[PDB]
């Protein structure tokens, strides 16, 4: 039952996202608000156990996943979608499509990390996080990251 409560929160965010995705700017704003409440509890709970770096490794990719799906909806949507980046509000950077795979390199290189690090990456990747690979999901490194992460 390792970090079960954290996992549920990450699932919930994935849900609040995949739902925003299947709507006007007052709905979006309410769900974003929920997401931010869920992030607050996720951080508070992880930081009782884990260093700041480990907490970031688990929460940044989830934010980058949410940002990516929202930016894509905002690209493909009939209505005007407004979305300030979560990854930027929380972690002061906006290069998530690259930095997630930098995180993934790190957790894959050293066998020091809690299992939730790998599960969080596995989840966003099973939910079609592409990041820097958006233009071509046939990329061999992209497929290797998936294979290697699930092997954990
Ligand atoms: Br949520
Ligand atoms: Br590339």
* Residue ranges near ligand 1 (ion) with Cβ within 5 Å: 12-13, 16, 34-35, 38
- The CA-to-CA distance between both ends of the chain, in Å, stands at 17
Domain that holds residue 104: 1-152
CATH number at residue 116: 1.25.40.590
Asked whether 56 and 91 are in contact (CB, 8 A), the reply is: yes
Region for 59 from its dihedrals, namely left if φ exceeds 0, alpha if ψ lies in -120 to 50, beta otherwise:
alpha
Q: What is the DSSP letter of 50?
A: S
Instruction: Count how many domains the chain has.
Output: 1
Q: According to the entry, how was the structure determined?
A: X-ray
Closest to 69 in 3D by CA, of 24, 107, 13: 13
Polymer length of the chain: 152
Q: How far is the CA of 44 from the centre of ligand 1 (A)?
A: 15
Radius of gyration of the chain (CA): 15
| Residue 71 CB neighbour total at 10 angstroms | 15
C-alpha 36/C-alpha 58 separation (Å) is 15
Q: How far is the CA of 137 from the centre of ligand 2 (A)?
A: 9
Q: Per-residue b/e over 5-16, b at no fewer than 16 CB within 10 Å?
A: ebbebbeebbeb
- Two tokens, residue 23: 């709507």
Q: How far is the CA of 99 from the centre of ligand 2 (A)?
A: 13
CA angle 58/88/51 to nearest 5° reads 35
Look at residue 146 and give its three-state secondary structure: helix
Q: How far is the CA of 11 from the centre of ligand 2 (A)?
A: 28
C-alpha 11/C-alpha 62 separation (Å) is 10
């Amino acid at each position: 039952m390792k970090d079960f409560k954290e996992i549920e929160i990450i699932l919930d965010i994935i849900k609040t996202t995949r739902e925003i995705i299947e709507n006007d700017n007052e709905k979006i704003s309410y769900h974003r608000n929920n997401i931010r409440k869920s992030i607050f509890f996720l951080q508070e709970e992880l930081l009782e156990k884990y260093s700041e770096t480990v907490c970031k490794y688990i929460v940044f990719p989830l934010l980058a996943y949410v940002d990516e799906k929202l930016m894509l909806l905002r690209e493909k949507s009939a209505s005007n979608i407004s979305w300030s980046l979560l990854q930027l509000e929380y972690y002061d950077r906006k290069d998530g499509g690259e930095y997630v795979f930098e995180i993934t390199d790190n957790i894959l290189s050293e066998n020091i990390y809690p299992q939730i690090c790998y599960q969080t990456i596995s989840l966003i990747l099973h939910n079609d996080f592409y990041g820097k690979y958006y233009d071509n999901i046939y990329n061999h490194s992209f497929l290797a990251y998936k294979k290697e992460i699930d092997k954990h």
